[PDB]
Amino acid sequence: DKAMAGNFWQSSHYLQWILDKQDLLKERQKDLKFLSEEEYWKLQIFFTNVIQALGEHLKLRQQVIATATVYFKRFYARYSLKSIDPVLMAPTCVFLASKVEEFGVVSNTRLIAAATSVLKTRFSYAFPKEFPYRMNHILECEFYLLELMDCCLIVYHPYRPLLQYVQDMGQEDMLLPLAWRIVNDTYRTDLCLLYPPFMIALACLHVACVVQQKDARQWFAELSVDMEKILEIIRVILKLYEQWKNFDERKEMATILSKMPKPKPPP
Amino acid sequence: DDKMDYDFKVKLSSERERVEDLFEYEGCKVGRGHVYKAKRKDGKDDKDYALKQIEGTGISMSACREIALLRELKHPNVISLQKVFLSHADRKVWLLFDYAEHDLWHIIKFHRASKANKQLPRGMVKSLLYQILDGIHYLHANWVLHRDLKPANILVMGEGPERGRVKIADMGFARLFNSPLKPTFWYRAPELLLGARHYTKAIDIWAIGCIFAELLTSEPIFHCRQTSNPYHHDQLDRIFNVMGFPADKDWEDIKKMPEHSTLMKDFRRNTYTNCSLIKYMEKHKVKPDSKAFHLLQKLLTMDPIKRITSEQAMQDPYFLEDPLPTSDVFAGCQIPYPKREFLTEE
Ligand SMILES: C[C@H](O)c1c(Cl)cncc1-c1cnc2c(c1)CCCN2C(N)=O
């Protein structure tokens, strides 16, 4: 779906949902009373993976899964993890993102079945109990998500510009599978809230060239871009993989999830 | 939800703007294709607004896509979403727009009725066509098809700061697999009638061609009397009665259309030998050597790959010929078209 493809600079994504890093950290401080900074980024990785798995189960294309992931991040960029259960928010984000597409629909039974099946077969280390939410809960949550996002549903991602850049290099076969995979990994971080997607694409492509020992220095020099901002992104990607190495989500997530601030019940 | 945080929940509920608090709309229904003519309750504007309550409950695929695209689209000739209300109790969705007093269905109907009480101003015709093309060009440049263009969807602003500006509205924002085959034929391009499996930019341009003819004559050019199947025999018969039957050279790929063999079975070239757009338009006092006509003929090209694009149509010498198109299609003149009446029917 190429709807609005060249409109990023006048888009709601750019004008409203590219956030300041210090505004992000300030709002995060309320959840940092319960979880450490390390534990917070580990939770983000966990729910990125949950959303990926839900999307794969439903056979949604990568771009739909990415949009869903961005919805999730935008919600918790503003609000505490206690506000709505992230276990409910994740499938709600996938459901809403799938409805922005007109090529096929995700049914109600299929959404709930997919949430139930993915959590029990792929995430039982984190969830001993069955997915407790029914479809009325998803529909309620959807209204809150749409409201928080100020109805901003069209999300731009690095996949489209990455594809253009590698085709411009003449190195699609060698570099695209790795570069694409690295773009997927950037959703384990805040990068999508902080930088235009084409910059994230350029960084992923740089890391892919370094990993494969491809000299693309002249090609990067031929671009008109702020390479300081690209290097900032590269550092977050390189750090992501060290975090990945040292993180065992399977051993740690049950404990980390138990430290999440819990919803205040009604009086 | 019981597992939602209570404080979070009551804070949002306390702050949430409700449509019924901000706007007076009860008794002010104007259309239902539920559309209301609304005024602000504080009295800080005195402007008129269109409130659309979306059909159904929750957020359907069609509702999602409509909200998604309107939230991004910004152009003087495309209707502009001001605000979305989410009504949590009944799970109803409301869309706020600036109110367009007029539209081409009513404007044309007014001229067609005036002909009986015995033409549409030609500076106005040109200016309308230019703005329709400008708005459609913007949508198309963003890979957004309308998919349902007709006079009822070409709104025209009344008295106010945007006097006589066209506003394209009611885009077909959701079609499953971008397909006409999934659940008036007067503005439908011949490829749709021969079973085209997808909507295209070209399909929109044909519809503009139809609207343009209708503005010039006051009659729907492919008027015809009123299922799942795309093939409509009587509509095709009408197209050929106006246009002539296409020669092989005019539309080489016609043979590839899914309904081509049905066309061959039901129709004979010989039937339409005295038929042409030239002949049709002459009968309605439009000269075939006019720049208006030559552009019209480029819009109403039968083979979609031979149809002019919106951008090329905007460059047509027609728009450089006196009189120049104006930003107010009424050109500062008094507006004779009546306002929309409030409906009181149950
Ligand atoms: C929601 C709609 O697109 C619309 C908008 Cl956003 C803004 N201003 C007016 C309208 C509007 C109202 N009514 C009618 C039309 C248009 C078309 C012609 C039919 N119609 C009636 N009332 O019959």
- Residue B109 and residue B217 share a domain: yes
**Cβ pair A99:B1 closer than 8 A:** no
d(CA B106, CA B155): 10
Provide the 10 A C-beta neighbour count for residue B183: 6
- Residue B236 and residue B89 share a domain: no
- Residue A172 and residue A145 share a domain: no
User: Which tokens is A7 given?
Assistant: 């409109």
- Residue B152 and residue B47 share a domain: no
- Residue A166 and residue A146 share a domain: no
Please answer whether residues B213 and B231 qualify as being in contact, where contact means their C-beta atoms are separated by less than 8 angstroms. Answer: no
- Residue B147 and residue B219 share a domain: yes
CA angle A98, A104, A106 (to 5 degrees): 50
Please answer whether residues A27 and B91 qualify as being in contact, where contact means their C-beta atoms are separated by less than 8 angstroms. Answer: no
- Residue B13 and residue B162 share a domain: no
Q: Which atom of ligand 1 is nearest to the CA of B97?
A: 6
B51 CA → ligand 1 middle, Å: 10
Q: What are the residues whose beta carbons fall under 8 Å from the beta carbon of A12, sequence distance 6 or more?
A: A150, A152, A154, B71, B72
Of A120, A154, A188, which residue constitutes the final position of a domain? Answer: A154
- Residue B266 and residue B225 share a domain: yes
d(CA B219, CA B213): 8
Please answer whether residues B172 and B146 qualify as being in contact, where contact means their C-beta atoms are separated by less than 8 angstroms. Answer: yes
d(CA B178, CA B145): 10
* Phi, psi angles (nearest 5°) of residue A180: -60, -50
For residue B68, give the chain A residue with the closest CA. Answer: A153
Q: Which long-range contacts (CB under 8 A, 24 or more apart) does A233-237 make?
A: A233/A191, A233/A195, A233/A199, A233/A200, A233/A202, A233/A203, A234/A203, A234/A206, A234/A207, A236/A186, A236/A189, A236/A190, A236/A191, A237/A182, A237/A185, A237/A186, A237/A189, A237/A191, A237/A203, A237/A204, A237/A207
Q: Which domain holds residue A181?
A: 1-22+155-267
The method recorded for this entry reads X-ray
The residue among B106, B90, B94, B114 whose CA lies nearest residue B19 is B94
Q: Which domain holds residue B183?
A: 100-346
The residue among A163, A159, A89 whose CA lies nearest residue A97 is A89
Length of chain B: 346
- Residue A265 and residue A242 share a domain: yes
Of B50, B76, B99, which residue constitutes the final position of a domain? Answer: B99
The residue among A40, A42, A35 whose CA lies nearest residue A244 is A42
B50 CA → ligand 1 middle, Å: 8
Q: Calculate how close chain A gets to B52, using CA atoms only, in Å.
A: 16
Alpha helices in chain B (DSSP H): 6-15, 19-22, 61-72, 104-116, 122-141, 190-193, 201-217, 233-243, 260-266, 277-283, 291-299, 310-314
Q: Which of B71, B142, B176 sits opposite A12 (nearest CB)?
A: B71
Please answer whether residues B114 and B132 qualify as being in contact, where contact means their C-beta atoms are separated by less than 8 angstroms. Answer: no
**Cβ pair A105:B91 closer than 8 A:** no
Task: Name every chain B residue with its beta carbon within 8 A of the beta carbon of A96.
Answer: 59, 64
User: Which tokens is B255 given?
Assistant: 């043979």
User: Which tokens is A165 given?
Assistant: 């850049």
Number of folded domains in chain B?
A: 2
- Residue A67 and residue A95 share a domain: yes
SS3 B93: strand
Neighbour-count burial of A263, counting CB atoms closer than 10 A to its CB (0-12 exposed, 13-18 middle, 19+ buried): buried
**Cβ pair B86:A5 closer than 8 A:** no
Q: Which atom of ligand 1 is nearest to the CA of B79?
A: 6
Q: Which of A7, A102, A263 sits opposite B142 (nearest CB)?
A: A7
Q: Is B103 a catalytic residue?
A: no
> Was B286 annotated as part of a binding site?
no
Of A127, A154, A181, which residue constitutes the final position of a domain? Answer: A154
**Cβ pair A153:B64 closer than 8 A:** yes
> Residue B108 maps to which CATH number?
1.10.510.10
Please answer whether residues B118 and B78 qualify as being in contact, where contact means their C-beta atoms are separated by less than 8 angstroms. Answer: no
**3-state percent helix, strand, coil for chain A, nearest multiple of 5:** 70, 0, 30
d(CA B121, CA A254): 74
For ligand 1, whether the C-beta of B103 sits within 6 Å is yes
Number of folded domains in chain A?
A: 2
Choose the catalytic residue: B103, B148, B170, B204: B148
Of B82, B99, B116, which residue constitutes the final position of a domain? Answer: B99
> Residue A201 maps to which CATH number?
1.10.472.10
For ligand 1, whether the C-beta of B340 sits within 6 Å is yes
d(CA A254, CA B238): 70
- Residue A137 and residue A53 share a domain: yes
> Residue B76 maps to which CATH number?
3.30.200.20
User: Which tokens is A209 given?
Assistant: 């060239």
**H or E element in which residue B183 lies:** none
Of B99, B134, B168, which residue constitutes the final position of a domain? Answer: B99
Q: Are strands B23-24 and B154-156 parallel, antiparallel or unpaired?
A: unpaired
- Residue B210 and residue B335 share a domain: yes
Q: Which of A4, A139, A267 sits opposite B72 (nearest CB)?
A: A4
Structure-token match 């993976």, residue found: A49
- Residue A117 and residue A32 share a domain: yes
Residue nearest to atom 12 of ligand 1 (CA): B31
- Residue A150 and residue A28 share a domain: yes
State this model's resolution in angstroms: 2.2
> Was B30 annotated as part of a binding site?
yes
- Residue B176 and residue B41 share a domain: no
User: Which tokens is A104 given?
Assistant: 């096929």
Cα radius of gyration rounded to whole Å, chain B: 22
- Residue B77 and residue B121 share a domain: no
**H or E element in which residue B49 lies:** strand B48-53
- Residue A45 and residue A79 share a domain: yes
Residue nearest to atom 14 of ligand 1 (CA): B31
- Residue B128 and residue B95 share a domain: no
Q: What are the residues whose beta carbons fall under 8 Å from the beta carbon of A129, sequence distance 6 or more?
A: none
SS3 B168: strand
Residue nearest to atom 18 of ligand 1 (CA): B152
- Residue A210 and residue A179 share a domain: yes
Preferred mutation among A10, A84, A99, A154 to probe B, highest tally of B CBs within 10 A: A99
- For chain B, counts of helices (H) and of strands (E): 12, 9
Q: Which of B6, B143, B175 sits opposite A102 (nearest CB)?
A: B175
DSSP lists the bridge partners of residue B81 as B97
Of A115, A133, A154, which residue constitutes the final position of a domain? Answer: A154
Q: Calculate how close chain A gets to B61, using CA atoms only, in Å.
A: 5
- Residue A135 and residue A40 share a domain: yes
